[PDB]
Design a protein around this ligand. Structure first.
Ligand code: SF4
Ligand code: SF4
Ligand code: SF4
Ligand code: SF4
Ligand code: FES
Ligand code: MG
Ligand code: MG
Length: 574
């Protein structure tokens, strides 16, 4: 073993790890900042994790290994003044205005300033933030007046996407972070997945705001404003109201959306069932025509952009079915009027997503028809949360209400969409019933679930074996293709999500403090909410959605053909 003295307390351990990690595992407080995802800022260590080691001096605990004979002190005056100096220096480059800041209620930096009572040697107060702000992107926004240059976004992008779209840049001899050549992120190989935002300890990286689109549309007398949340929203937004993790708040969201003044409360899970109708039918179609295999999902715009930027040869292999968001939006301007009498142009369709990329998908030029946008606005989970708080809605104390069932009902299949393997399973539940023309009892495909990067399974459909795969994260898509796993066998249907764990870990999701990520498996705790809804729902198949069946019977007809194929589909091409 090793003998380690920390603050006078002796430890006898055989572990090989860092001071920070060992300290955290023994309830010994050590501050940190730039350390996240088992990596720190190598070229510019923040030194917030400084601790004293007798015979060595001050050392960074987040990358310093424990060694026998170490006598560590974490709270000496020499350590605190050092940490206080670094935080003070960061403040010299930080616009310290927490009042209007969108991270006011969960900023790692603010908590560090309060903790050490640090103050700026000179308050950073830029007159014009123009040069510091980049709002060119449809999904991302950079405010470099808040940027600590901790590199956590850069490292996050590398790990999650392996695109390294977020880079350190030298602008006029000044270190900043941004896209390649300081271009607009959209104009680069960036996936707009927002993982860089999630890793950001401050409000330096945020989503491109759409709240003005919403509030204007709401206050517009003639505008009929629809709202519909994604699957993952009802399993995460509760976190930003001190309700904890893994708490279902579906009913509370519906009520909150009515108090905010939305004219109609629908649900994207209804659109998730639609996507399954239009994707399960296509899978069966491609089987009969024998290809083109494999069929890739197309509901994740992060993946779409990844295909557009790295694998354009696969764009014709993507499912023509629109994403649950876009497919919902299409029906909102055509079907919903036909059952409400509303003038389509007065219909304003808003979605609540866990995703920053969804903003880019919704504003795609061709994502419309007859001048009518499928989706007019997308607000992240964080945006809706702020919208609720600004309205002074006591969310945690709201009583449950239901959505409007015309486009608000959803089966358990559409419910699990928010988790990696969700779309896959949901699609197989319908495709097997379609191909075999039956109503099979066994519908649970646990094989394609979980947090494994790459997941594969052999499924039987109409007395024939087919190979499916589920790519869990953009970095795993790169690995899947580069390593030649695609060519090792003939796959017939592949799911691809950009964010590891699925949309429950989207870029528009609530920020989780590093100390909570250690205590909670955010990806599984969030997904559990979705699977629990699937288990307790009467309808667990997309095509068993009564409200949707009505819609298809009375308006669209059959899926994968006629009117359905006409307007609910969207093909990508190189
Ligand atoms: S980023 Fe954090 S510390 Fe800086 S102004 Fe915003 S809330 Fe305050
Ligand atoms: S944008 Fe955020 S994560 Fe990136 S360097 Fe600045 S503070 Fe760190
Ligand atoms: S949105 Fe995703 S791909 Fe783009 S820079 Fe951020 S982490 Fe990288
Ligand atoms: S996995 Fe979901 S949340 Fe992440 S980029 Fe794709 S659609 Fe958005
Ligand atoms: S947390 Fe250790 S150097 Fe940043
Ligand atoms: Mg390191
Ligand atoms: Mg109104």
């Amino acid at each position: 073993m090793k003998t380690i003295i920390i603050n006078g307390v002796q430890f006898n351990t055989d572990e090989d790890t860092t001071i920070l990690k060992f300290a955290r595992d023994n309830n010994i407080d050590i501050s940190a900042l730039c350390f996240l995802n088992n990596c720190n800022n190598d070229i510019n260590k923040c030194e917030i994790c400084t601790v004293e080691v007798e015979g060595t001096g001050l050392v960074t605990a987040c990358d310093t290994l424990i060694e026998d004979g170490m006598i560590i002190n974490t709270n000496s005056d020499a350590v605190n003044e050092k940490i206080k100096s670094r935080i003070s220096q960061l403040l010299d480059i930080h616009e310290f205005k927490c009042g209007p800041c969108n991270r006011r209620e969960n900023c790692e930096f603010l908590k560090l300033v309060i903790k050490y009572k640090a103050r700026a040697s000179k308050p950073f107060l830029p007159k014009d933030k123009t040069e510091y702000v980049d709002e060119r992107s449809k999904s991302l926004t950079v405010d470099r007046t808040k940027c600590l240059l901790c590199g956590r976004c850069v490292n996050a992008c590398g790990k999650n996407t392996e695109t390294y779209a977020m880079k350190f840049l030298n602008k006029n001899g000044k270190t900043i972070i941004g896209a390649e050549d300081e271009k607009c992120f959209d104009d680069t190989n960036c996936l707009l997945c927002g993982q860089c935002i999630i890793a950001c300890p401050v409000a330096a990286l945020s989503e491109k705001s759409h709240m003005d689109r919403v509030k204007n549309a709401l206050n517009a007398p003639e505008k009929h404003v629809i709202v519909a949340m994604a699957p993952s929203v009802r399993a995460s937004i509760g976190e930003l109201f001190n309700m904890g993790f893994g708490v279902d708040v579906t009913g509370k969201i519906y009520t909150a959306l009515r108090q905010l003044g939305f004219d109609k409360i629908f649900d994207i899970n209804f659109g998730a069932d639609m996507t399954i109708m239009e994707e399960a039918t296509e899978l069966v179609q491609r089987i009969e025509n024998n290809g083109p295999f494999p069929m890739f999902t197309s509901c994740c715009p992060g993946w779409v952009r990844q295909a557009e930027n790295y694998y354009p040869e696969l764009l014709n292999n993507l499912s023509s079915a629109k994403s649950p968001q876009q497919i919902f939006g299409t029906a909102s301007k055509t079907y919903y009027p036909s059952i409400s009498g509303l003038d389509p142009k007065n219909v304003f369709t808003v979605t609540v997503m866990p995703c920053t990329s969804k903003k880019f998908e919704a504003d795609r030029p061709q994502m419309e028809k007859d001048g009518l946008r499928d989706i007019d606005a997308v607000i992240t989970t964080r945006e809706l949360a702020k919208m609720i708080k600004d309205a002074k809605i006591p969310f945690a104390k709201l009583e449950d209400s239901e959505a409007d069932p015309a486009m608000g009902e959803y089966s358990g299949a559409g419910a699990i969409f928010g988790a990696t393997g969700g779309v896959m399973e949901a699609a197989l539940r319908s495709a097997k019933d379609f191909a075999e023309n039956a109503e099979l009892e066994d519908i649970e495909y646990k094989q394609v679930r979980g947090l494994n990067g790459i997941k594969e399974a052999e499924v039987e459909i109409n007395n024939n074996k087919y190979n499916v795969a589920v790519i869990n994260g953009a970095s795993n898509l790169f690995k899947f293709m580069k390593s030649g796993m695609i060519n090792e066998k003939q796959y017939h249907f592949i799911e691809v999500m950009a964010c590891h764990g699925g949309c429950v870990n989207g870029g528009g999701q609530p920020h989780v403090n590093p100390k909570d990520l250690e205590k909670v498996d955010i990806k599984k705790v969030r997904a559990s909410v979705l699977y629990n809804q699937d288990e307790h729902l009467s309808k667990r198949k997309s095509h068993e959605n009564t409200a949707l069946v009505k819609m298809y019977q009375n308006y669209f007809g059959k899926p994968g053909e006629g009117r359905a194929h006409e307007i609910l589909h969207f093909k990508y091409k190189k």
